Amino acid sequence: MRPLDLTEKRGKKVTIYFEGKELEAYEGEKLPVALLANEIYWLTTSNEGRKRGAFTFGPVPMTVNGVKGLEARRIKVKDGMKIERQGYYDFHEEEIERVVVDVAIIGGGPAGIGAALELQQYLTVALIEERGWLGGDMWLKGIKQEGFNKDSRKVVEELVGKLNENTKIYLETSALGVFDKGEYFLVPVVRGDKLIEILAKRVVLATGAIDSTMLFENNDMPGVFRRDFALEVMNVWEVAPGRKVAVTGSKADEVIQELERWGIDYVHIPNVKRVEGNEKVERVIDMNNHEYKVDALIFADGRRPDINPITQAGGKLRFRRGYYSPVLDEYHRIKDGIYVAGSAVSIKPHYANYLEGKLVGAYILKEFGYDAQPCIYEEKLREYEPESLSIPRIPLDKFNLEDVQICGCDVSLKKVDEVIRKGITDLQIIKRLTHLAMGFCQGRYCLFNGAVVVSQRTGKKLSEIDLPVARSPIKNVKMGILAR
Amino acid sequence: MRPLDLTEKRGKKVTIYFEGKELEAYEGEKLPVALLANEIYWLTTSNEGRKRGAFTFGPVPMTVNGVKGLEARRIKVKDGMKIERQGYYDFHEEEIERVVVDVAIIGGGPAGIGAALELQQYLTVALIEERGWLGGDMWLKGIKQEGFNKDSRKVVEELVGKLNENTKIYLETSALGVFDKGEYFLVPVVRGDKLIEILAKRVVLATGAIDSTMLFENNDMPGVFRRDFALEVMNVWEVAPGRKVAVTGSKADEVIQELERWGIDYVHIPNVKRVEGNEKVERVIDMNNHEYKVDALIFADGRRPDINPITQAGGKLRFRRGYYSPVLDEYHRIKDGIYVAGSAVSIKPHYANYLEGKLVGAYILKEFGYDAQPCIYEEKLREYEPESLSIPRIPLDKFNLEDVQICGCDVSLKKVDEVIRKGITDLQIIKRLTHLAMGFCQGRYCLFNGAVVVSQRTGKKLSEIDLPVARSPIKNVKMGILAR
Ligand SMILES: Cc1cc2nc3c(=O)[nH]c(=O)nc-3n(C[C@H](O)[C@H](O)C(O)COP(=O)(O)O)c2cc1C
Ligand SMILES: Cc1cc2nc3c(=O)[nH]c(=O)nc-3n(C[C@H](O)[C@H](O)C(O)COP(=O)(O)O)c2cc1C
Numbered sequence A, B: 001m002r003p004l005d006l007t008e009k010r011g012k013k014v015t016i017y018f019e020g021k022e023l024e025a026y027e028g029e030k031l032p033v034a035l036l037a038n039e040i041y042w043l044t045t046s047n048e049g050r051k052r053g054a055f056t057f058g059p060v061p062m063t064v065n066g067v068k069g070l071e072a073r074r075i076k077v078k079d080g081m082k083i084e085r086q087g088y089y090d091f092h093e094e095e096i097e098r099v100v101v102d103v104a105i106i107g108g109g110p111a112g113i114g115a116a117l118e119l120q121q122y123l124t125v126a127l128i129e130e131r132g133w134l135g136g137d138m139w140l141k142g143i144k145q146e147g148f149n150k151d152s153r154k155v156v157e158e159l160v161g162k163l164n165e166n167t168k169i170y171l172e173t174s175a176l177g178v179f180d181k182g183e184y185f186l187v188p189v190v191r192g193d194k195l196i197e198i199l200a201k202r203v204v205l206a207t208g209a210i211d212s213t214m215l216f217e218n219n220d221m222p223g224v225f226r227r228d229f230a231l232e233v234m235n236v237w238e239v240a241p242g243r244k245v246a247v248t249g250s251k252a253d254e255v256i257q258e259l260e261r262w263g264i265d266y267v268h269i270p271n272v273k274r275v276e277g278n279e280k281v282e283r284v285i286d287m288n289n290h291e292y293k294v295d296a297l298i299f300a301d302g303r304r305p306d307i308n309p310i311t312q313a314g315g316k317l318r319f320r321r322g323y324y325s326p327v328l329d330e331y332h333r334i335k336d337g338i339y340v341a342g343s344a345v346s347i348k349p350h351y352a353n354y355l356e357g358k359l360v361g362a363y364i365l366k367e368f369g370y371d372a373q374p375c376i377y378e379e380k381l382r383e384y385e386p387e388s389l390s391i392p393r394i395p396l397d398k399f400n401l402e403d404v405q406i407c408g409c410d411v412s413l414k415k416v417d418e419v420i421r422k423g424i425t426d427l428q429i430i431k432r433l434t435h436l437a438m439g440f441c442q443g444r445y446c447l448f449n450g451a452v453v454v455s456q457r458t459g460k461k462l463s464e465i466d467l468p469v470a471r472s473p474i475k476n477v478k479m480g481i482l483a484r
């Protein structure tokens, strides 16, 4: 057992080296998780000298066997592996498959599975998921779940269990976007390092929501965990974020329930001002200047639909219930032939998103001439009012602005605030002046916040501040993979 | 075979007497039909001396064995029976059951049966029908029907076939209205001469549409058949309206198809001005003064929802698509707890009205806690656009107004036109001055026409001329039956 193991691992034991030090890991574990288990948090430094971990926004470039600039999260641990830290900008110096399919479902959470289950009654589908497992956010929980009155992870197993050979599953697979060729849609997809082109008649974006990022002082430092990452390490791998854990944000109960299940000690800090520490977090300070000693901070401030795949697919947005949503016709369509389902549509219980996927799959099944009954899913859905999110009042005056990070790359809240103060309110321009939303997330974890700041400094309402649209490759792909 | 028999009848032969004359009839036949078969049309005279039959608006009081004032349509023929004509106002001088039920469905056409079929999965229903058979208007057809791609009367048999013991059927049973007691509804019902009180939690009005009445000169004279009566005698009993038949109105094809099936010769007169003859029709004259020799005229100018049971139940009306309809909430409710289904709601194919009955039954099943799926019926219904009806321009200037009858009782078009000409436009007042809608139909076959006349003479739009509401007993009941 390593110090942060929640279980004794029974996988094949393996040995790796971090900065020369000999560490034990298990086969199949991903680099940052093996290092966490061994109490190692600080994995890289940004170009302007900011220490960083793997469990919040931003990329983790690491030298993995003399090969510079590999992404830590993507790398499985391997016996004899030589791992080292490096600069942010340090790079290394040194057979297309075509598959035709009826629908192409992007995203493998409850919505995606839902759609696939409905669809494979008669059609051939691609279920595309970049994640390596086929649950959704649901596979991150293991707490009993409403709707299917049954344990979160047990439901996923049941559902995956029910998939046909009519469903081609694509794990560890990144969709690069959707391209309408009139007669079909092209969804180019990357798995391992092969490019696969999926030509489909229909598409469904079952694309999910992403966790909102909280603005407080060293919010990027090692040992801060965004909700999803904390749940992943605890529930998927079985590793604690730390020995004693601070928890914050408006959905902190979801996290606390997991902590309690695993018996991980914690404090609940409703309003975080700052985190401090040399390599990692060791104190958090609240808005009343109270300090708490802890090894990690976990924040959970609500999920918001990931709008990138929507807007690259050519969909339009609406602001409602504290977040941006897809504008849909009466059939959950973004545009003719592209359906949207799940937490991509709105925030609501897993079961609801599951139904919406079935709903969306049923419409296309009806399109195809099969006798489906989308409305039974429709009427089940209405039983679930979509959730709201409070819009954050960022106490700008009360923060030391250069310490609070807005995006992954450079980009402090101060830089953004500065340009707004000089009159610029158009996010298009803000994007260019500061590098907000130009980093390796494409604004996923910062655009909305940038908007909130403009809105706050301006008085201009959020339902009027329109968002820069997502462009060509919605996910990072390198570049060799795309020739010839 | 009698002269107007379409088949040789194999029922028990019986013998009756009309005005002394010995006639042959069959057991189970109703008086006016036996007399028609024997070429007898003129059955009574109105108080102001107008000869009348049984196949258009108005009552048929007859002396049936020295008992004056019995209603011809209601009387079954019986061996030795002595039948005579009489004045309109000639009258004779000389154990309540309580049944509690979940729903009480008023009207036994496809809508009613539809509702009952849905409902008896779990609930106990009363299916109430005054008609003696359980089809609807559908049982009047015997032509292949859309929806259930199958012969009209064969579908009825199939459907009735499927009724449980959870459905109490009440044939030859007149509902007197609906009375909300909060904790339940009272639907008093008359069968034979017993009064039955049905106490139900829910009610559905599956009440039907009635055939519109055409305004032309002697439109009340013997040998004029309203669509429904012509179909009844031909298809239910098997007796021809006449040897050679004139057909008119905008739904004349429905009738012509039946005529052709039975091989009954006919002429199609698109625009009738007048019918003439001593005892019966013998000529019809068109708007261009062309004459045709015939034995009967059949008119079919569209059905309109019967609004009486609706308004006595306390529902409100809307004018759309050329006719008055119930105002419904989003659940086909007139008012809490009273559902409306079928051609009572709108004009559309039998199959659609069948679905609407299932729809309505499913909602109440959901109300009761059972898991029903009203929406599958919902979405099937949308496949059927409700039909329109042209609003008639009555050529008032071109008619001899005192010959064209508006209501059953006295009441010529002239009487109505007169009062309108003297400034009165409120139907409330018209009702009182002339006796329009005070006869033994309660305006069923004349209110709308009265409105059309006002509208035509006034310029005032029909969607603004509101209709006198139906009151206490929606159907005639006598009076002894209601003590003690
Ligand atoms: C000189 C220049 C540099 C740019 N650098 C970046 C960049 O570093 N990251 C990025 O995501 N986009 C970059 N862009 C693309 C901008 O997002 C660009 O204004 C754009 O995408 C146009 O807006 P649209 O894509 O919404 O139409 C750059 C564009 C220009 C002209
Ligand atoms: C003197 C008098 C005679 C009436 N005669 C008849 C009648 O012969 N037939 C009929 O249906 N209603 C008759 N009524 C009832 C009218 O329809 C009456 O104005 C009425 O119903 C009130 O309108 P409401 O029922 O719509 O509230 C009569 C009412 C009065 C006062």
Ligand SMILES: Nc1ncnc2c1ncn2[C@@H]1O[C@H](COP(=O)(O)OP(=O)(O)OP(=O)(O)O)[C@@H](O)[C@H]1O
Binding pocket: A106, A107, A108, A109, A110, A111, A112, A128, A129, A130, A131, A135, A136, A137, A138, A173, A174, A175, A176, A177, A206, A207, A208, A209, A309, A341, A342, A343, A344, A348, A349, A350, A351, A353, A354, A474, A475
């Ligand atoms: N471009 C992409 N390529 C492949 N997978 C993607 C892409 N974008 C998003 N996804 C995946 O879609 C999945 C979204 O599932 P998620 O569980 O978040 O939402 P859901 O299925 O609507 O239901 P719920 O939000 O309640 O779990 C995530 O697993 C995410 O990795």
Ligand SMILES: Nc1ncnc2c1ncn2[C@@H]1O[C@H](COP(=O)(O)OP(=O)(O)OP(=O)(O)O)[C@@H](O)[C@H]1O
Binding pocket: B106, B107, B108, B109, B110, B111, B112, B128, B129, B130, B131, B135, B136, B137, B138, B173, B174, B175, B176, B177, B206, B207, B208, B209, B309, B341, B342, B343, B344, B348, B349, B350, B351, B353, B354, B474, B475
């Ligand atoms: N007060 C009443 N008591 C008993 N029966 C009634 C009463 N009022 C109307 N009805 C009956 O309701 C039935 C209506 O059925 P009808 O077939 O006209 O309409 P439907 O079932 O909606 O479908 P469709 O119009 O297509 O046939 C008729 O048989 C009529 O006699």
Ligand SMILES: [Fe+3]
Binding pocket: A407, A408, A409, A436, A437, A438, A439, A440, A441, A442, A443, A444, A446
């Ligand atoms: Fe970024």
Ligand SMILES: [Fe+3]
Binding pocket: B407, B408, B409, B436, B437, B438, B439, B440, B441, B442, B443, B444, B446
């Ligand atoms: Fe009348």
